[PDB]
From a paper:
Hemoglobin (Hb) and myoglobin (Mb) are the key molecules in animal aerobic exercise, as they are responsible for molecular oxygen (O2) transport in the bloodstream and its storage in the skeletal muscle, respectively. In the present study, we investigated the molecular evolution of whale Mb by experimentally resurrecting ancient proteins. The analyses of their chemical properties and structures demonstrated how Mb molecules evolved to adapt ancient whales to deep-sea environments. The atomic structures of the synthesized aMbWp, aMbWb’, aMbWb, and swMb were determined by X-ray crystallography to 2.4, 1.6, 1.4, and 0.8 Å resolutions, respectively.
The aMbWb and aMbWb’ proteins are the common ancestors of the toothed (Odontoceti) and baleen (Mysticeti) whales, which would be closely related to the early whale Basilosaurus27. The seven residue replacements; namely, E27D, V13I, T34K, D53A, Q116H, K118R and N140K, were deduced to have occurred during the evolution from aMbWp (terrestrial ancestor) to aMbWb (aquatic ancestor). Furthermore, the ten residue replacements, D4E, N12H, I13V, V28I, G35S, K45R, N66V, G74A, D109E and F151Y, occurred during the evolution from aMbWb to extant swMb. Unexpectedly, log S0 decreased during the evolution from aMbWp to aMbWb, and remained almost unchanged from aMbWb to swMb, indicating that the total solubility in pure water has not increased during evolution.
Numbering used by the authors: 0 to 152
Amino acid sequence: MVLSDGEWQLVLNIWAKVEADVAGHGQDVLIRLFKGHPETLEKFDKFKHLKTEAEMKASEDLKKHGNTVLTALGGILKKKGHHEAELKPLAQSHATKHKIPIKYLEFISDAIIHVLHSRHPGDFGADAQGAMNKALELFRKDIAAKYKELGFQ
Ligand code: HEM
């Protein structure tokens, strides 16, 4: 389920803009995730104390984790169609340690798309949106395959 060269270029072109403020994007993504799907917040022992959007926005640890998430995703995206090594430890920890259903990965994928549109209305047009959908679909597909191996799928 392979992206074209042009599709990868669109993905990484918008991603280079994310990289001007990775932590801010990452915090926005986690806030969108937690507000839209509160069950996801409950998987984070270290964030479940946050009861309001303002509290989420004020948390420096949440911002840091947002940076961690998007920096790791950036690493995956820059490997384009060959991200096996980067994806492996992530699937492993999310399956066995953090116990994160694939469905929650769908939720965060949608949150990323939402945030990219919110912050970049002009640059993140339909072509880039579609290419980013495909890149995040491939991410989910490959994680789900590792989950299946490990009996978490
Ligand atoms: C784009 C998708 C995601 C990426 C790239 C990502 C990345 C990471 C990374 C790099 C870490 C630290 C290293 C590790 O433990 O593997 C981490 C930790 C963690 N992730 Fe994710 N993650 C993603 C999605 C999610 C989702 C959707 C959830 C929950 C709904 C989640 C829950 C957790 C938890 C609970 C930890 C440990 C947090 C702590 O330090 O207390 N992850 N994630």
